[PDB]
Amino acid sequence: PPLTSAQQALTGTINSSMQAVQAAQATLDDFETLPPLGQDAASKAWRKNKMDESKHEIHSQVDAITAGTASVVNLTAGDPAETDYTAVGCAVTTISSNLTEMSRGVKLLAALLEDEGGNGRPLLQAAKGLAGAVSELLRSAQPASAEPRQNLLQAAGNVGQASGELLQQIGESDTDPHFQDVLMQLANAVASAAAALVLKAKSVAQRTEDSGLQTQVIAAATQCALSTSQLVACTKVVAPTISSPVCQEQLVEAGRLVAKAVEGCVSASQAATEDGQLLRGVGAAATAVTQALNELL
Numbered sequence: 001p002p003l004t005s006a007q008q009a010l011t012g013t014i015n016s017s018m019q020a021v022q023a024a025q026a027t028l029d030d031f032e033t034l035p036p037l038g039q040d041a042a043s044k045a046w047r048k049n050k051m052d053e054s055k056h057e058i059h060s061q062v063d064a065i066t067a068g069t070a071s072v073v074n075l076t077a078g079d080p081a082e083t084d085y086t087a088v089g090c091a092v093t094t095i096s097s098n099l100t101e102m103s104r105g106v107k108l109l110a111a112l113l114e115d116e117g118g119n120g121r122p123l124l125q126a127a128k129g130l131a132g133a134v135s136e137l138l139r140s141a142q143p144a145s146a147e148p149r150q151n152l153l154q155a156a157g158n159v160g161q162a163s164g165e166l167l168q169q170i171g172e173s174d175t176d177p178h179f180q181d182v183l184m185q186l187a188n189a190v191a192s193a194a195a196a197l198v199l200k201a202k203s204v205a206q207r208t209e210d211s212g213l214q215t216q217v218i219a220a221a222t223q224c225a226l227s228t229s230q231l232v233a234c235t236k237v238v239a240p241t242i243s244s245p246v247c248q249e250q251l252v253e254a255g256r257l258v259a260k261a262v263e264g265c266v267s268a269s270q271a272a273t274e275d276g277q278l279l280r281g282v283g284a285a286a287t288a289v290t291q292a293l294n295e296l297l
Contacts, residue, residue: 006085007143013089017096018138024103025131028124031111032104047116054105059172061102062163063244065130068094069137069159070234070250073152076141077230077257085143092141099134103127109170126169130162149226153233160237167240180239186295187235190258193291194228197221197262197284201269204281208272220261220268227261228288230254235295255296262288 003011037043071091076083106127113120137159139145140152164180167173198221205217213219234254238247262285269281 003144007080010085010089010092010141010143014092014138014141017092018135020096020100021131021135021138024100025128025135027103027107028128028131030107031114031120031124032107034108034111034115036115047112051109051112051116054109055170055172058102058105058109058170059167061098061105062130062167062172063241063247064098065095065102065134066160066163066237066241067244067246067250068092068098069134069156070237070247070254072137072141073156073230073234073237074250074253074257076152077227077254080143088141092138095134095137099131103131123169126162126166130159130166133159133162150229153229157233157236160240163237164240173240174243175240180242183235183239183242183295186291187232190288190291190295191228191232193284193288194224194258194262197265197281197288198225200277200280200284201265204269204275204277205272207275207277213268214272217265217268217272220265224258224261224265224288227254227257231258231292231295252296255292258292259289 037046068091072088072095075088075091078084106123110120110123110127113123133155136155137152140147140155164173201217201221201224205214205221208214208217231254234251238244238251241247242251266281266285269278
């Protein structure tokens, strides 16, 4: 079906934002020209002032890119008609304007490492990584696109990754590294616990007593995977942050999409009820429910 007005409007927002991401991207070519200073009084502690202002601005701005990209992921999870297209549009504009701001800061900062220290071109390098990454997230956000869903998922997790390697450059990185890898593994115990669930539902419902959903037990099992698959992407995107109270809000909000996809999975099976196959659903269900409790810490 052709996009609705709300959808067309979101498109015009992604379009404006994609255009600004392409501009900021075209800004990360060289360093911001600095007025050669010297050990001159003021000058000497200018490289430190401006280094530190921008080193923390970058931070806050990456924080809003990740939060917003977790937010776009969560917001579009719905079904076109339960989707709030102004909120997602708002999230995209937040990603957008923050990337434009972070670029100014990086041109400047990277130039102070390039003069004062030695080489600070890996900063412009990291920044293009992110920009480029948020461009791939915006393209998948286009409501008239076929992908499917997993394509937006990957692109968002790539945004997290590029944010990590970026904040790592500027050493602005609050989350005890590898604690991130504990997050990454803890979110994958939820996915595999889920494949078990999606699995146990293949069984029930290839015994579904003549159809009727049958096709809802599969539909429900498929939503389980996809919601779980979304938790993984979000964990990836918010990990380099998680210090930020809002990435956390989003992270637990994807947990809720998971709990719901899970519960929706047991009632589909039970509507097709009776057997020992049923006890198994609840078991796998207990499993994913427990696995996710863990990662929610």
